[PDB]
DNA sequence: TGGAGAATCCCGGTGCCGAGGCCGCTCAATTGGTCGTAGACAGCTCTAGCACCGCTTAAACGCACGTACGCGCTGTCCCCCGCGTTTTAACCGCCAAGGGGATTACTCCCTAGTCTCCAGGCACGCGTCAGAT
DNA sequence: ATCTGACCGTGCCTGGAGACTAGGGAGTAATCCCCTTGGCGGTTAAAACGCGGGGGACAGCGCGTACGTGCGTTTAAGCGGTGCTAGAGCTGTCTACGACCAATTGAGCGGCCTCGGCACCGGGATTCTCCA
């Protein structure tokens, strides 16, 4: 194949890569022989120690979060205080990473519909990161591996951008209310919307 | 003349006052005290006469109970006279500070 | 269809109806039952009789015919159950009981 | 109105003490007792004035003092109820 | 019109002491005693009804309130008098 | 059951952001809020019955706070409640 | 659909306070400013308790408050010791206070 | 059946040393066992009354909290 | 050590402590023995017995504080039963 | 031991003012009837309480010794009690008056009640990160 | 150096909020009458002050003993684990009990008049206290 991004594009900082991270098609080749061809609609960014909600705030050197400063663009699937997973790729620097939030597929709905049921409307079937992590067959065995090896998950280039404030973080701190998360305008399949931010 | 030994008049005063029910503080200094304390909270107040009598009965009963507890505090220290230490200790055990 | 008072039905002197009206317009519950005013009237009648019998005995001990507040103070403070029911009250014009500790009496 | 706490005389405190069963009284009792009385009344009528401030009245009634005493666990019988 | 427990305390006084009267200040004291005991028992019955998620005060609530407030022998005699009154009221 | 846990946590995060509360201390704060609620509501109920008024408005709550709290704490609580009521009425 | 907690600038639920005032049999009718006032008073009191407790935990070099810090906060302040006088705190201990005549 | 003696002498000493006491006489222990027995009897009797009205046979902690609130000894930390 | 030196160390240790100084299972047995005389065949939640333990500990510690001030008032450093009776009478229980 | 002197008690007579009965009338308790829902009663679930079993181990326990401490006795001197005398002002009586509580009439705006709906809030998951030891 | 009790995604659910109607409780104003502040004055009771002297507070000393401290045995709590089932907790159903309303009627409350219990006065018998 040819539509796979390399290390010349993944070696970028947080904000300019996250601004160019709209509509990208994250495809995991699950071994049944099918593909999802799902397009992203919203992402989240962590610049570093400036944001208090980041997991690497103030130069954290935890033994779990150690593969991000070795090389930029590192694959990172990780739990959220339990069994729900989230999808992340890091960047050059300290505490800088981008997280994938919501996807919209075009095919293979029945497979993820059966795999989700471990009442089944497709609007709330993939409206969140833990929903797509239970739809893209995402496990804990995707931590020590790059984005350009063998036949695993990669990126594909598919065919207005509004910055919205964080929802669900509470009214605390001085960096939890800055609008930095980018999401599409006018799409009726977005989980987190901002009606007051549509007028800029 | 006849000269009573110290203590006997005190005991007969204890009999006389514990036998009677009449209020011991003069009413007009207590009325002026109530009005002087009430001047610090709301200026130009007025008092019903029954209110000042109620305050006098409450204050006299409180002082008599405190003097009972003060007396047992003084007897606890193997004394007969009462000191400010006894009033302070009685108020600290009762919780009033 | 002769009217019988609820106190006359319960064999009581305290009013069942007034106790019922006060339980209604005192904001104690949204509903007040039928047996609750009868029971509370009987309890209040018993407590009134218990104070008044001892106050009458105290007034008879002082060779007097009518009960003054001093007799009520003696009746309350000379019964232990009535004293601990009424331990934080001031009977006005009531005085105190005659007691002196033994270390103040002369030898 | 000034220095009316001295109107509660030394024989008045002696009468209240021999009501309470006290045989002998030191000289420093009286001033101390006066202070105690002030701490009582500044705690009682401050409530009662407050009650008078809620009914929009200018007269401190007896029943207000009864309520102020019942708030402090010092319930008074014989002046309404 | 001021309501008071005057004639009822007169009737109980003449029932227990037929040759004994009473003064006006003792009416004030006994009226305040009846009002305070009423407020105490009724407030405890309100708390009991609020605790077990009930909306009705019955004789069971007043019975448990009388048991909670009054000391032992007085409480037992009060419960006996109240249940006698309630049984007589229901049966007649 | 219903508790004041999340609101007490929000008050904590406003006053001390780098501070946490254990479970038992949160239970103590729930008991404290319920106890102060019962005290102020009971004093407001008594002041409704004394003045023969059937409504508990901000005046009874203000004087219940003034009766039930010691001096500087009562003054600041009255000031905060008056500020909240005026801002709510203006909005 | 603005809630009354955000309408008054308060962190406590005005609606839940209003519901507990209605269902608590306090009076027949309740006002509109009364739950706002009561929620503001409760929020101020818990802010003062939490501030003094966090100070007591910071002096003990602990970043999470326990009931001991609450006891130190209440009984080191005079006004809260006056308010919470007849109230005991589970696992609160007592203040370090040694009488003078016992020390040599 | 004498379980009041299970409140040991060093337990009374520990409770006094938290209370600031330096020396303890040998007749303190029986007196404070009687004190604990009276206080516990009062609170347990009120809690059992609450359990009787609730028509239960298990004494809950809420009944103990209500019993201590009745005496004026409010306990925070047990759902009160 | 000299007498009174280890005692002040125990005071400074136990006042900084938090935990329950009375033993849990004999206290539970005493609670059962007291409640047997009121209703037969009772049951207790564990939180009820812990609540009774915390209330009893706080009550006895406050009583011993007042007992200590009664003993210091009588020019003594040893507390005696008369001090407990005096503090309990001034409180109002006796 | 008698005895002087003061204090408390006790008899009978005066007079007053407050308790106690009579009575008219308002107004609140009672009698029937409806109607609605709170609550008693039966039944099932599954949480949590209870009884019991070994182990190890920290705490209770008994004993020995000694020194701090309670407690009794004693001397001193200071402060408070008793009493007479003089100054002070409570108190009783009476009156003026004016401010303030109570009451009634009449609105009128705020809160109860109800329908609909939607966004907070309680229940859930367990690696591990700081947090505590 | 080592143990350990809380941290943003998700289904759903249910109580709070907007909107509309009604009615009654509180606000406002004029009027009325108890009642509370203020003043004058005489009388006499109570407080204030001085002084003497008894007696208790207080400091010091000595002694007996009784608690503190420490050490070795001992014992039964504490923690963990297993089995069993009583009873808390919830749900459905039906019906009995209370809220509410209207008519009726008697009883309790205010007004009012009358006489007797009780405070007071005064001389005489009794008792207490101090004393040589």
Short mmCIF file of C-alpha atoms (C1' of nucleotides) in Angstrom, two decimals, chain A residues 60 62 64 79-83, chain J residues 119 124-130:
data_model
loop_
_atom_site.label_atom_id
_atom_site.label_comp_id
_atom_site.label_asym_id
_atom_site.label_seq_id
_atom_site.Cartn_x
_atom_site.Cartn_y
_atom_site.Cartn_z
CA UNK A 60 5.98 13.43 35.45
CA UNK A 62 6.05 7.58 35.99
CA UNK A 64 3.92 3.56 33.01
CA UNK A 79 -7.45 2.57 30.71
CA UNK A 80 -9.53 5.25 32.43
CA UNK A 81 -9.78 4.30 36.18
CA UNK A 82 -11.12 0.80 35.34
CA UNK A 83 -11.94 -1.17 32.19
"C1'" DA J 119 -29.85 17.25 32.24
"C1'" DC J 124 -20.14 1.06 38.28
"C1'" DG J 125 -15.59 -0.56 36.73
"C1'" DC J 126 -10.78 -1.77 38.77
"C1'" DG J 127 -4.42 -0.30 37.58
"C1'" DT J 128 -1.72 2.95 39.69
"C1'" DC J 129 -0.26 7.71 41.39
"C1'" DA J 130 0.66 9.86 44.78
#
